[PDB]
UniProtKB/TrEMBL annotation:
CDD domains: PBP2_TpPotD_like. One of its GO terms (cellular component) is periplasmic space. It is found in: Periplasm. PANTHER family: SPERMIDINE/PUTRESCINE-BINDING PERIPLASMIC PROTEIN, SPERMIDINE_PUTRESCINE-BINDING PERIPLASMIC PROTEIN. InterPro entries: SBP, Sperm_putr-bd. It comes from the Bacteria. GO terms for biological process: polyamine transport. This is Spermidine/putrescine ABC transporter, periplasmic binding protein (PotD). Pfam families: SBP_bac_8. SUPFAM superfamilies: Periplasmic binding protein-like II. Keywords: Periplasm, Signal, Transport. GO terms for molecular function: polyamine binding. PROSITE patterns: PROKAR_LIPOPROTEIN (PS51257).
Length: 319
């Protein structure tokens, strides 16, 4: 009678949770987390108490190899038929959805204050602009920042090549970092709203939630299209030891109902990247289109190649 949901703060719209609660006469314990590292920690060897968790594609692959996830019974999730074919092809960490079901696919991008920066190219190299120095931020995320640098240099955002990573590190350290106030994943949208940052790396839903609607026309948010910018996919997974698998499946099935998925997308101004029905049911014009995610590269599990990422990033981030 209770579903234990573990997800990013606000990521499951409470409005949808109430509906699932009213429909099934159940209650949802929704514990939030601020990162997949933190989520992972609760689900570490061996068993949290959760029925559902929402990891990104790299963390689905990591958690499969560490045997942290339970097989999903797709017969209990008929609405899995709404998952676009194009998405099915990209989810190589779990292509048959045996351990995961897609929740959302999007990408971080760049917001530019068009009144403060009238001329700019719509590219990552915007962070090398010395005329905007100390009025920009990039995200406090290693895979996003390294990924953007790798993308810009024509390298795979998931590369395992050591000289490509060093090259990316030099790009961030020597070309972008000197122009940044800081790396910031939580204050950038507010600082962008005040005018403190005039260009910032981040999520469209944050920039637009945080800036009054009156001032939206002055924002150009874009995911750079001239390179294979990093893209993410988040998924429902059932943690090892889940006590209520029946409600876990029922919730994934509920979330993927066209009107209920559309209500999810509309909450954040998301396009229907994964769902073949939901766009018809949406009330909100998306902040970016699904076609903006085509050229980009899905962030994946890099395996050991992580040690090189870590070593370069800790230097970028703490020096
Ligand atoms: Cl705990
Ligand atoms: Cl500063
Ligand atoms: Cl937000
Ligand atoms: Cl503004
Ligand atoms: Cl290294």
């Amino acid at each position: 009678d209770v579903l234990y949901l573990y997800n990013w703060t606000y990521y499951t719209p409470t409005s949808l949770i109430k509906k699932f609660e009213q429909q099934y006469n159940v209650q949802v314990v929704y514990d939030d987390y601020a990162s997949n590292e933190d989520m992972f920690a609760k689900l570490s060897i061996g068993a949290s108490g959760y029925d559902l968790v929402v990891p990104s594609g790299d963390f689905v692959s990591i958690m499969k190899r560490k045997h942290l996830l339970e097989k999903i019974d797709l017969s209990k999730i008929p609405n899995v038929q709404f998952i676009k074919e194009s998405v099915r092809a990209r989810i190589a960490y779990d292509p048959k959805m045996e351990y995961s079901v897609p929740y959302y696919l999007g990408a971080a991008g760049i917001a530019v204050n068009k009144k403060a920066v009238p001329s700019y190219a719509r590219t990552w190299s915007i962070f090398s602009r010395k005329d905007l120095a100390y009025r920009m931020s990039m995200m406090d995320d290693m895979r996003e920042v390294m990924g953007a640098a790798l993308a810009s240099l024509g390298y795979n955002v998931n590369t395992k090549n050591e000289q490509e990573l060093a090259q990316a590190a030099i790009l961030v350290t020597d070309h972008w970092k000197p122009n940044l106030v800081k790396f910031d994943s939580d204050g950038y949208a507010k600082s962008f709203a005040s005018g403190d940052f005039v260009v910032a790396h981040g999520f469209a839903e944050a920039f637009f939630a945080e800036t009054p609607e009156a001032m939206h026309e002055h924002i150009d948010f874009f995911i750079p299209q001239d390179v294979a910018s990093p893209v993410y996919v988040d998924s429902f997974c059932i943690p090892k030891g889940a006590r209520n698998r029946d409600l876990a499946h029922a919730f994934i099935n509920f979330f993927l109902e066209p009107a209920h998925y559309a209500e999810f997308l509309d909450t954040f101004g998301f396009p229907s990247t994964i769902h073949r029905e939901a766009a018809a049911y949406q009330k909100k014009t998306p902040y970016y289109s699904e076609h903006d995610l085509e050229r980009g590269t899905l962030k994946t599990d890099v395996g050991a190649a992580i040690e090189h990422y870590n070593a370069h990033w800790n230097a970028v981030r703490f020096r």
